[PDB]
Write a protein that binds this DNA or RNA. Sequence first.
DNA 1: CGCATCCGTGAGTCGAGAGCACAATTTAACACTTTTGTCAAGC
DNA 2: GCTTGACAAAAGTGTTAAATTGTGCTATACTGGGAGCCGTCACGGATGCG
Lengths: 146, 44, 195, 95, 73, 49, 73, 279, 73, 98
Amino acid sequence: GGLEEVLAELSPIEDFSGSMSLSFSDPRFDEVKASVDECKDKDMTYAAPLFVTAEFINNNTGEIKSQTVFMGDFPMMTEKGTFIINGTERVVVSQLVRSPGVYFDETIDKSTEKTLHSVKVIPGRGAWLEFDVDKRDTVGVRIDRK
Amino acid sequence: FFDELRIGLATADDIRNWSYGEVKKPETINYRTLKPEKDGLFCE
Amino acid sequence: QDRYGEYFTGAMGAESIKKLIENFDIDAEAESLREVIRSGKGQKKLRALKRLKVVAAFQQSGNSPMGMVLDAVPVIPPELRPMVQLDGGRFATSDLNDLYRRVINRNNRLKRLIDLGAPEIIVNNEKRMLQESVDALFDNGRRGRPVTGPGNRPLKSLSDLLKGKQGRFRQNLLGKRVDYSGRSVIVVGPQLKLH
Amino acid sequence: LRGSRLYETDRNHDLAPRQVARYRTDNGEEFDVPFADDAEIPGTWLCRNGLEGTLIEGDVPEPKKVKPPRTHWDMLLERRSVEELEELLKERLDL
Amino acid sequence: LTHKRRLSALGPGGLSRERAGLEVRDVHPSHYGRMCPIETPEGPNIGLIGSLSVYARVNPFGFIETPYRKVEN
Amino acid sequence: APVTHIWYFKGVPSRLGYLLDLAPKDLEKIIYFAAYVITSVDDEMRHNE
Amino acid sequence: LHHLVDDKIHARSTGPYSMITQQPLGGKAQFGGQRFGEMECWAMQAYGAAYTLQELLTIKSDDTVGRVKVYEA
Amino acid sequence: AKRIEAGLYATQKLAELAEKGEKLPVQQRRDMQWICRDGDRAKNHLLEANLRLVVSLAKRYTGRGMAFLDLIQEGNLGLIRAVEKFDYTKGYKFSTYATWWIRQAITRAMADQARTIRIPVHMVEVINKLGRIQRELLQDLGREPTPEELAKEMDITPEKVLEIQQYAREPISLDQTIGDEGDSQLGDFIEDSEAVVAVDAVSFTLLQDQLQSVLETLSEREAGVVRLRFGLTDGQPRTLDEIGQVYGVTRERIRQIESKTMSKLRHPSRSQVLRDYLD
Amino acid sequence: LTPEERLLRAIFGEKAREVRDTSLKVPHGESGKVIGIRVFSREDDDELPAGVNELVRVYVAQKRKISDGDKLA
Amino acid sequence: GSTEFLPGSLTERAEFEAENRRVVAEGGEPAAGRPVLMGITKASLATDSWLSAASFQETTRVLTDAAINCRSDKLNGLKENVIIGKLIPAGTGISRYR
DNA sequence: CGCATCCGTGAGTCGAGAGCACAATTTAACACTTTTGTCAAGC
DNA sequence: GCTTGACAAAAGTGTTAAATTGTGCTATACTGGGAGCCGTCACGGATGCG
């Protein structure tokens, strides 16, 4: 799941000059605090508490301080597909975005009128990498917009 | 009844003459009694 | 400096530029530029023309270029940067007066550092910070990354108050909201006269 | 949504009487302040340029009871006595 | 119902209303069965906001799939 | 400490740059304490010694 | 449709003003004044209606003393 | 540290001996000034040496309404203080003593300069204590702690907790983007509450016109006492004696005149025209 | 209080009351029956924002008939 | 020539000819001028009124140039009059009808 | 010298939506005195 | 109508006790940040890198 994926991405963690580590796992939802119309009338968010088991390890001795931690109130989706925030019903609209990948294209130059081809690598996060072909018939690269 | 509007380059002397007092504190208003603080911003 | 300290003088910061302007003669520069314009042909002529465009302004006037270096920044009246007590006790403040505060803070710290004789590195760093704060006060985001407060929205500087489509020129001077006016939907009246 | 900030018959013929003072600053800048006839003029005033100004007439030199701030030397004394400092100075002077 | 099936090109990581040319807001052949070519704002948001089609489904990678009947011979 | 108005420092063109004939990149380093600039040189004293 | 003249009719003669510019506020929520935009000024100049434009831009917007004196008159 | 102390004592000795003359040998004086210069150089060298520690400690307090470079500068000021107070005799590493002063200077500067409305340090301490207690409570309670529980835990009344929370409010920017577009800001919706209301400003001048004219004039000279009593002639209310200080009228007679005028001016025939301006 | 207001109060024997009116009044151009009222008082739980002791909501419902200017489609 | 004009600057034909005919009397060295076409943006932005130029576009640059040049504005341009609040010099606003 | 980078500017007009220890400065709090007004009989 | 006189009721000062606030100090050792970066799009014009 999404929460499990994010937690796995975060953990494990070790401090600079590693001597001890921490990790999170196993998200769990127990039950919604209140119901739909109670939240709508009383002007409160319709959320449920979230619990994650955190494990702390001491590399020197090999201890395990594993136990559950309260992550906060996660807003929940109603049967209609809406979020009740502060007693108001809200909708999250899907967003159209260019997917990450490698994209090639070509353009006709103005001076020489040669066909010049370029490629760009678009990541989710990271420096931008893009190659190019010049009108002098040379293959170059711009690294991190340099 | 205006004849003309002249723009120029303000000097230190002009800026000092425009002023009625030097601001030498970043305080704007005290937390209780919500009144302007002396020698700071909004000083009376 | 150690070998020939008394044979020359050097400096950094706005003070050095102030000294340069103070000991910079404009008549000789204008004459030299004119002679280069009438003589030179290549890019030298264009550079001389562009430089003369600026030099002649100070030459043929009663104003000196010393105004480009500031020894006392002015402060706008508080009403134009109001601290209004919103309903319920909340306070809304124009971010302009925030910028001012920073300046003062830094300008105070420098006064302390010079007082107790801090090492030149710290004094220079403080002077640079004061320069940047004043720059952002006059025009935020021009040179470097704009100064931001809560969230990530850049602060509104003095220049921004009258710069573009919003501001004063095109929003409060050339067209404004007026009293004794209304608005409503229109329907066709066929029995009406043309007037 | 509204906010707030922190009408009497105007008259110019009749006004409360006033007397004008005169102050000089350290730089020789002259300033004038209109005070009421109640007087009680202070010996020192704050002028528009941010510097203390004193009366032109030259009266009431204030006692100047201010105390100087604590220096590095005072802070040194609180952790060292004169004997150890003298010994250190003698040791350094040899080189 | 139509609000919950809205596909928007704006928002963080998306387009800006002042920096969107004709090409992005025009109808593309791939839209068939995924993005409705009719339902869209009339004002300056023309072509930047649309609606999901009746049969369209979202791939876990985020791509929109549409059903077709297999025909052979 | 004196400061320079940003408008005349860099405005495309730089008014200070044209007035003194220093490139904006060089003028930038002086203002922000990145490199020293010579304000005056004693030619007569140098020649005599 | 949800476009009824009942909830869009408001007029104004005098109401709240702005903190800094001292001009009338806008919007039916307050006693909003209609904006006399730049194009309207161009139209008035084309007509040659110097006096109407002057009263619109000074008396009826932000001539603080003029507003109360005109009401009294 | 020893060089700095030696230079300090050398300059102090020079100052002390200056008053009592007693010119010293040239060599000794030159050596004394050399010690002073060496001590100053040592002080500086220590400062540049520990600027890195200053930066290391300063980088921990980012994102609390203060610039990173301002934090660094305040930290190095605290480090200057620490150097002034450092004692080499105890034999401890300079960093151990310098960290305390650097942290103190950074926190004090943040307290004094991190808010548009300045709160004294003694209130900032209370606010920080409240925040820490609330954070601790949220973990174990699971719910949101109520004001009464916090008040009990801090040995103060709940009203004090509410007052502290009110003081914790932060002013909002008057240049926002209410409107979902670069069209309107927050300042365009806050009406001025001091602008002169036209109609009111008219009614008042009518009340001042319909009162000063009719009822004042039909009272002959008995109007004068009323005018001074309420000060409607120059905005200067006057006590009874302030009429008798010059004019020969006596105290109780003035009050009798006031009572008679008050009684007879409330007659409906002349008390109905002015009965509509009460609001 | 202004001298004129002081005299007016004196002739009518009206107390200079400590409190000013800030009652919630119906906005301009509104109408309809009152159908529901909700009250929250800090005394009976009612976890209101800090500083708020009472919160009152009033619902006004009105029946609108089609009239000139309404938009149909 | 002996004129006040800087070389390479855009000068109005009226002022150009007036200056040439004024200097030819005693100076006898008129300046040489070539007709030039300019766009609406540059033509409008070159107006002698710094108020209107600042109101149009490039407020910062216009104000900077006006400040260094120290050039005053005579308030008759049909666009600064509205800013000042003075009735425009057109239609009913001209002196003849006013 | 000349080419590629970089920079500033423009975008319809209305709408609806961490802590303690002092020392110094200011404030409430009470007591008391002076000024103001009130009631009574008076000729 | 115009005074005199005997009394509560407020306007003003004095002096204390209390609340608020401005500075200073704390000794294991600790020594160069982190946010980056997202389709105009065309137009000139200045800059600066080689």
